[PDB]
Amino acid sequence: XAAXLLLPX
């Protein structure tokens, strides 16, 4: 994903 290092990707 595009949320820093929160969600898997």
Is residue 1 within 8 A of residue 9, CB to CB? The reply is yes
Residues 6 or more apart in contact with residue 9 via CB below 8 angstroms: 1
The residue numbers preceding gaps of C to N over 2.5 A in the chain are: none
**What one-character DSSP code corresponds to residue 2?**
-
Q: Quick check: helix, strand or coil at residue 8?
A: coil
Residue labelled with tokens 């949320």: 3
